[PDB]
A paper describes a structure:
To understand the role of non-canonical tip-link EC repeats, the human protocadherin-15 EC8–10 (PCDH15 EC8–10) and the mouse EC9–10 (mmPcdh15 EC9–10) fragments were refolded from inclusion bodies produced in Escherichia coli and used for crystallization and structural determination. The structure for mouse Pcdh15 EC9–10 (3.35 Å) contained 228 residues starting from Met 898 to Glu 1,125 (in the most complete protomer of the four found in the asymmetric unit). A structure of mouse Pcdh15 EC9–10 (without EC8), crystalized in a different condition and space group, shows the same unique features. This suggests that the EC9–10 interface is robust and that the observed features are not a crystallographic artifact (Supplementary Discussion). Sequence analysis indicates the absence of canonical calcium-binding motifs in the PCDH15 EC9–10 linker across different species. Consistently, the PCDH15 EC9–10 region shows a calcium-free linker that is bent (∼90°) and breaks the linear arrangement of EC repeats. In addition, the PCDH15 EC9–10 linker has structural features not observed in DNcad, Tcad or any other cadherin structures. A unique EC9–10 310 helix is located in the middle of the EC9–10 linker (His 1,007–Ile 1,011; blue arrow in Fig. 1d,e), and an atypical EC10 FG-α loop (Leu 1,091–Asn 1,105) form an EC9–10 interface that stabilizes the observed bent conformation of the linker. In addition, EC9 and EC10 have unusual and unique structural features involved in bending, namely an EC9–10 310 helix and an EC10 FG-α loop that form part of an interface that keeps EC9 stuck to EC10. Also, unbending was not observed and the end-to-end angle and distance were stable throughout both simulations. This suggests that the EC9–10 repeats are bent in solution, spontaneously and occasionally transitioning between two very similar bent states. Overall, the data presented here strongly suggest that the bent, calcium-free linker in PCDH15 EC9–10 plays a relevant mechanical role in hair-cell transduction.
The tip of each stereocilium is linked to its tallest neighbor by a ‘tip link' filament essential for hair-cell mechanotransduction. Immature tip links are likely formed by homotetrameric protocadherin-15 (PCDH15) proteins, while mature tip links are made of cadherin-23 (CDH23) and PCDH15 heterotetramers. CDH23 and PCDH15 are unusual members of the family that feature 27 and 11 EC repeats, respectively. Here we present the X-ray crystal structures of repeats EC8–10 and EC9–10 refined at 2.8 and 3.35 Å resolution, respectively, which show an EC9–10 calcium-free linker that alters the linear arrangement of PCDH15's EC repeats.
Residue numbers in the entry: 898 to 1125
């Protein structure tokens, strides 16, 4: 019998593509498996696009039948920041032939317009534990072609001990620091292009994320002695 359909690994895939991408530019691979006995038609999954609800994405993208790679059907000329919903259907060679669908949300964006930091690690001089709010700690720097850069701290600042000026990329002291509580931090930072920020999006990659090693400088204050 053939009584199990293909089941996509994910319900919604993501993927990027340049706005001027040539024909057959690879975007992403989708994937689905079939629970019927292996080696047979019933569990032999082919991939196809669909144009019921989203015919235009289907007009410019296509999925390969056997590999599952999503690619450009045409040399494209679409506008940046756009998001398309391409609908992919995986179907078996069974009897009766079963299937299931899934969505590939594709982002139209240039790779070269994603920012690049000046360093992957920033090691600024050690900040006094008694430093006041607003005391500058260090500064981070990132370029991108035809792009102004918004900076953000994305991880490692769980204590809200730091803030960053989201435009100058200047990291500063937000809460008061205690050396005895914690002697060092490592922030994950992220430069995103302004055009991207405006479309309510973030696009991380190796070159638009960097680390900041902050070192706390001990002064004579009241040491915490015991806790609980
Ligand atoms: Ca099947
Ligand atoms: Ca202290
Ligand atoms: Ca101290």
């Amino acid at each position: 019998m053939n009584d199990y359909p293909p089941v996509f690994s994910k319900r919604i895939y993501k993927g990027m593509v340049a706005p001027d991408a040539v024909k057959g530019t690879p975007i992403t691979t989708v994937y689905a498996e079939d629970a019927d006995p292996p080696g047979m038609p019933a569990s032999r999954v082919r991939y196809r696009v669909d144009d019921v609800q989203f015919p235009y994405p289907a007009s410019i993208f296509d999925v390969e039948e056997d590999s599952g790679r999503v690619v450009t059907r045409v040399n494209l000329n679409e506008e940046p920041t756009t998001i398309f919903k391409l609908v992919v259907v995986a179907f078996d060679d069974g009897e009766p032939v079963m299937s299931s669908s899934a969505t590939v949300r594709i982002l139209v964006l240039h790779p070269g317009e994603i920012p690049r930091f000046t360093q992957e690690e920033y090691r600024p001089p050690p900040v006094s534990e008694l430093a006041a709010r607003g005391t500058v700690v260090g500064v981070i720097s990132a370029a991108a072609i035809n792009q102004s850069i918004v900076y953000s701290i994305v991880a490692g600042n769980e204590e809200d001990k730091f803030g960053i000026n989201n435009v100058t990329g200047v990291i500063y002291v937000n809460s008061p620091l205690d050396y005895e509580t914690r002697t060092s931090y490592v922030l994950r930072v992220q430069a995103d292009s302004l055009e991207v920020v405006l479309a309510n999006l973030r696009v991380p990659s190796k070159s638009n994320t960097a680390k900041v090693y902050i070192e706390i400088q001990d002064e004579n204050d009241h040491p915490p002695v015991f806790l609980e």
